[PDB]
Symmetry: C3
Subunit: 272 residues, 3 copies
């Protein structure tokens, strides 16, 4: 209730990353335009909380990740932090854990996440995008994964996701060369899911998110769980898997769906 | 009959045939599938199985929604309907003899599930594809989801399942959801000639290759014994015996295994 | 020499495994399969080499399946057959598990064991006009587990079956859309394309390249994010000589001169 101080307001506005609620969407907005959204420790550390906020808010159905009005999604890592975070082995290990946690938080979001990409999406930028469920990019976006250019190695999680999306050959091409490639190529590789006109990615993501928001959220969330399960060893016989299917018939959205199909009208689903 | 088996050696055709409901899949039909598949695998004149929508101008509009009240009334009935469908799809997926789906017109919901359970898919231009449980407040089962994932990958699977959208055969093709895309109305002839190509080689090899692939998909490795011994029976069976012999005699092989 | 049916050419930073039995369109024989693991080891042992290429030399074919003239001998007895299988499996495994990455450059015929070789390499580039086929079904045999695994991983279940159930020959364009090859180039240019590609890779940190390859193979055979080898692989990223040089190069804004060999 208490209105702020001027400074408090500025601190929340100049967060290098933030959450905008516009029901039924929530938008994780990268917000360090001075550095073309280069990913810093402050940002990585904030992500798991932002994702939680969004999943906790019943008015939100879908999460978007985008680069705001910075004309870039994420231009790799903040080199100004390199001295600090790579000074010691311990600092380095911590940086890794912190990043892995952010990506895992996104990947395992109960509610689905769509990445909307314009301009530069390199290094951790690709990692973020890959952690999202869906990716849409505007023509002119540039993609690259560059640890080989530093003498590093792309982590297991990041590598697993990339592999799942584009396969072994393309994953190696990307990682062995560290090359920057175009959105059109990314599209044919299967690295992104939809390719749109330059500057329209965010609008495209929003309408797409609208399509998803209109169907049963019970189903959407369950489908996502089922897919993650299967990707990590579930089988047809696995109990969580069988029972996940069976709650399909028990939830509030299901009766409305049956009825809607019989009446030939769009479903007005209630589960939130 | 709403579903049936037509034998035309070397093919067997599982034909869906409830045109009144655009081949919407009912409990009677799902329950018949495992038997039809077995009939076909048991018959030595049959080498390849086709699944198609007959002359109903649709492959399958999925499950019969008019049965939904009954079969999903109780938790027990629901569990049974799921088991019954899963059994049909598994029966197809694990058919000793390979199965080709020939798709025209609508292939949605359980339709896609059937198609994904087949080994090969050919579709005519104008076929429409969709997977819609999200529009009913349901969830796509694990088996069905596994197969779809294996064919088109995580991004496309989610697109399909999160939107429940209907998409065209051309798009299906580029997604890798179907294997061959042909002229409208020709899918069934295309499937038949394709089946003919396969029928002409060693059926021992075909059936062994299918076993090896399923094995690998469910945890086999290079070191696995069934896998090693499957390979080695390659050199012991009658078709290879015949193949070896044919090469030595410089004549075409007449394969006998069935 | 150059009478050798298969050999290793060193041209630092590349090593080229060159198939060279043009009289049989590089059809793979037992002498050749048996030589492969050693050639791969030679190359991995030589610190001047960073990347390995496999190609069909000036024979206008990558590999035209198995040597038919050996069929009687190697498949005469069960024992001979078992041995042939082991010998081939060992060649393919040697390639697949090469510390240093391997690129296949394909022109013309790539059938049977030809495809198996190509699939064992990390990367594949092919010229238009290359022809691809996997044919054990035509002889009454079955494609081994390793070969099948790799093919499956590259093109998925539907396409793997199409290929194997029909034994049909198909074009490089189709191979490309199937994901069977990684890059498709103009006829006759595959080898040059492979070389420049290999040059791109050779220019970055070899520590990273070799680690990336290990990480991928790990993930393909059951590793998870939680797996210790995986966690510690990542962390040695920050400890090795190339990263030290990489860090310094980024700070000084200059190209890295990577030293790990």
């Amino acid at each position: 209730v208490d209105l702020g101080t001027e400074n408090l307001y500025f601190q929340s506005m100049t967060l290098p990353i933030r959450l905008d609620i516009a029901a039924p969407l929530a938008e994780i907005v990268l917000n360090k335009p001075e550095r073309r959204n280069a990913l810093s420790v402050d940002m990585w550390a904030a992500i798991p909380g932002l994702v939680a906020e969004a999943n906790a808010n019943p008015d939100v159905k879908l999460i978007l990740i985008h680069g705001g009005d910075a004309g870039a999604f994420a231009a790799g890592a903040d080199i100004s932090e390199f001295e600090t975070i790579y000074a010691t082995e311990d600092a380095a290990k911590a940086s890794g854990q912190r990043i892995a946690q952010a990506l895992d938080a996104i990947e395992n979001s109960e509610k689905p996440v769509i990445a909307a990409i314009e301009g530069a999406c390199v290094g951790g930028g690709v990692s973020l995008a890959m952690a999202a469920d869906l990716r849409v990019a505007g023509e002119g976006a540039k993609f690259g994964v560059t640890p080989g250019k530093l003498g590093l190695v792309y982590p297991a999680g990041d590598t697993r996701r990339l592999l799942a999306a584009v396969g072994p050959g393309a994953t190696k091409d990307i990682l062995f060369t560290g090359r920057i490639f175009t959105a059109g190529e990314a599209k044919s590789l299967g690295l992104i899911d939809r390719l749109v006109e330059k500057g329209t990615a965010l609008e495209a993501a929003r309408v797409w998110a609208g399509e998803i928001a209109a169907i049963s959220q019970w189903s959407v969330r369950a489908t996502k769980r089922m897919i993650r399960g299967l990707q990590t060893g579930w089988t047809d016989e696995t109990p969580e898997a069988q029972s996940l299917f069976l709650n399909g018939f028990a939830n509030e959205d299901f009766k409305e769906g049956y009825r809607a199909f019989l009446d030939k009208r769009p479903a007005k689903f209630t589960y939130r």
